[PDB]
Structure 1
Amino acid sequence: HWGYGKHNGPEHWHKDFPIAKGERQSPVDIDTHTAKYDPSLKPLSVSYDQATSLRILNNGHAFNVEFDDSQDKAVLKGGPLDGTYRLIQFHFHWGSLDGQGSEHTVDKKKYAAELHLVHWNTKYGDFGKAVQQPDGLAVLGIFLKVGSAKPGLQKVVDVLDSIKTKGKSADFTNFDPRGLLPESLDYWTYPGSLTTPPLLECVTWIVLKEPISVSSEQVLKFRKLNFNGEGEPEELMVDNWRPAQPLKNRQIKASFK
Structure 2
Amino acid sequence: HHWGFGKHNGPEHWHKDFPIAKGERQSPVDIDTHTAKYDPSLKPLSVSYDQATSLRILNNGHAFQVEFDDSQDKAVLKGGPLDGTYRLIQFHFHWGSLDGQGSEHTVDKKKYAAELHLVHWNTKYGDFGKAVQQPDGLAVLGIFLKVGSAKPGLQKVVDVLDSIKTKGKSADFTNFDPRGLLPESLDYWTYPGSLTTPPLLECVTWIVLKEPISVSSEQVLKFRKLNFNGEGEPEELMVDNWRPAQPLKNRQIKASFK
TM-score computed with the length of structure 1 as normaliser: 1.00
Aligned residue pairs total 257
Superposed CA deviations along residues 118-168 of structure 1, whole A, max 9, x for unmatched, are 000000001000000000000000000000000000000000000000000
Q: What RMSD over aligned residues (CA atoms) do the two structures have, in Å?
A: 0.2
Give the CA deviation at 1:186.
0.2
Q: How does 1:106-255 map to 2 (within 5 A)?
A: 106-255=107-256
Deviation at 1:217, TM superposition (A): 0.2
- 1 CA distance for matches of 2:247 and 2:194? 12
Aligned-pair CA distance for 1:102:
0.1
Compute the displacement of 1:187 (Å). 0.1
**Alpha-carbon separation, structure 2, partners of 1:42 and 1:166:** 40
Question: What is the Cα deviation at residue 10 of structure 1?
Answer: 0.2
Q: Deviations over 1:2-39 (max 9, x none)?
A: 00111000000000000000000000000000000001
Q: Does the residue aligned with 2:12 lie in a helix, a strand or coil?
A: coil
- 1:183-228 Cα shifts (integer Å, max 9, x gaps): 0000000000000000000000000000000000000000000000
TM superposition shift of 1:251: 0.1
Counterpart of 2:52 in structure 1 is 51
C-alpha distance in 2, partners of 1:202/1:247?
16
- CA apart distance, 1:240: 0.1
Give how far 1:51 is off: 0.0
Q: Distance in 2 between matches of 1:42 and 1:161?
A: 41
Q: Secondary structure at the match of 2:130?
A: helix
Q: Quick one: percent identity of the two aligned structures?
A: 99
Q: Distance in 2 between matches of 1:170 and 1:42?
A: 38
Q: How much has 1:76 moved relative to structure 2?
A: 0.1
Using the TM superposition, give the Cα deviation of residue 87 of structure 1 relative to its aligned residue in structure 2, in angstroms. Answer: 0.1
- 2: CA distance, partners of 1:193 / 1:6: 23
Aligned mates of 1:98, 1:21 — CA distance in 2: 28
Shift of 1:78: 0.2
CA distance in 2, matches of 1:47, 1:94: 26
Counterpart secondary structure, 1:11: helix
Q: Report what 1:89 is aligned to.
A: 90
d(CA) in 1 for partners of 2:40, 2:183: 22
Q: List alignment gaps of at least 5 residues for structure 2.
A: none
Distance in 2 separating the partners of 1:49 and 1:98: 32
| Unaligned runs of at least 5 residues, structure 1 | none
CA distance in 2, matches of 1:256, 1:32: 11
Supply the distance in 2 between the matched residues of 1:41 and 1:209 (Cα, whole angstroms).
15
Secondary structure of 1:12's partner?
Answer: helix
* SS of corresponding position for 1:141: strand
Return the alpha-carbon distance in structure 2 between the equivalents of residues 154 and 256 of structure 1.
31
Moved over 2 A (4+): none
